[PDB]
Amino acid sequence: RPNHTIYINNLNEKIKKDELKKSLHAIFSRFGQILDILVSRSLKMRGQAFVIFKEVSSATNALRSMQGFPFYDKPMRIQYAKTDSDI
RNA sequence: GGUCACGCACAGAGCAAACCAUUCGAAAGAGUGGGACGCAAAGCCUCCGGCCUAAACCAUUGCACUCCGGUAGGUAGCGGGGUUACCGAUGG
Ligand SMILES: Nc1nc2c(ncn2[C@@H]2O[C@@H]3COP(=O)(O)O[C@H]4[C@@H](O)[C@H](n5cnc6c(=O)[nH]c(N)nc65)O[C@@H]4COP(=O)(O)O[C@H]3[C@H]2O)c(=O)[nH]1
Ligand SMILES: [Mg+2]
Ligand SMILES: [Mg+2]
């Protein structure tokens, strides 16, 4: 199951794009290093976030410590990603 | 002369990008005043394509690194099309 990139789900769609990036950046970067965050609010991409880490154990600790967290008054559904980012 | 096209002018007009001020707006963007980048319809209309915004209503639990919900607003100075018009190259 474990992977590098973090896939966040069930996020608040009312939140603007830029702020969501910044809100997730500040919250998560206490676990490890971050290269980029990808978020869009297209029909297919709503309530979703992608975090580009370097190591697994940071991302694992990011996942296992806050799964179900009421971020912006909504539970965070946190599970791993599948494909390596094209960067 | 009319009409339909056309723009190498002539002649009298017209409009106003950017920026600034101010109002409206959630925003894109619009109004107004100053100001001219340009414009042969840069007059007027969103019917079609594009592009831009997304606050609200409805829809949506979605795995991306092309871009993609409905709806609503916007752009006519992004094209298409509709509609109106000044001048007239011994002009076609
Ligand atoms: N009366 C009349 N004359 C015409 C017309 N078409 C062409 N001309 C003549 O041809 C010149 C160059 O035309 P342009 O390439 O459209 O280049 C023009 C045009 O792009 C622009 N312009 C000026 N006035 C207007 C206007 O009322 N509407 C538009 N759309 N553009 C204008 O400025 C340029 C220079 O303007 P001008 O000093 O008048 O110089 C004009 C004008 O003398 C027309 O339909 N009516
Ligand atoms: Mg003149
Ligand atoms: Mg003409």
Side-chain angles (χ1 to χ4, degrees):
Chain A
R1 281 182 285 262
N3 196 280
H4 280 287
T5 304
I6 294 293
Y7 174 88
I8 311 152
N9 181 50
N10 199 58
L11 295 158
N12 194 337
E13 295 168 359
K14 291 165 185 171
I15 311 309
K16 275 184 150 194
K17 197 194 88 168
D18 294 330
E19 200 184 3
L20 188 61
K21 257 200 204 166
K22 197 169 148 62
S23 295
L24 287 156
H25 194 87
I27 282 296
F28 274 93
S29 53
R30 62 164 274 249
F31 287 103
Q33 295 282 345
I34 292 165
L35 210 80
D36 194 24
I37 288 164
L38 288 313
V39 160
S40 57
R41 276 154 70 211
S42 64
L43 176 80
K44 200 145 278 188
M45 300 312 291
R46 304 189 172 212
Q48 294 164 264
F50 292 103
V51 191
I52 303 170
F53 271 107
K54 186 188 171 69
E55 288 179 325
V56 185
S57 73
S58 55
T60 316
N61 208 289
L63 191 149
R64 303 189 94 167
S65 307
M66 283 174 174
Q67 193 215 291
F69 183 85
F71 204 85
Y72 280 117
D73 312 344
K74 285 214 84 171
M76 287 171 80
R77 302 305 168 199
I78 322 170
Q79 275 180 333
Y80 312 97
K82 294 167 182 186
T83 55
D84 264 353
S85 285
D86 303 16
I87 283 153

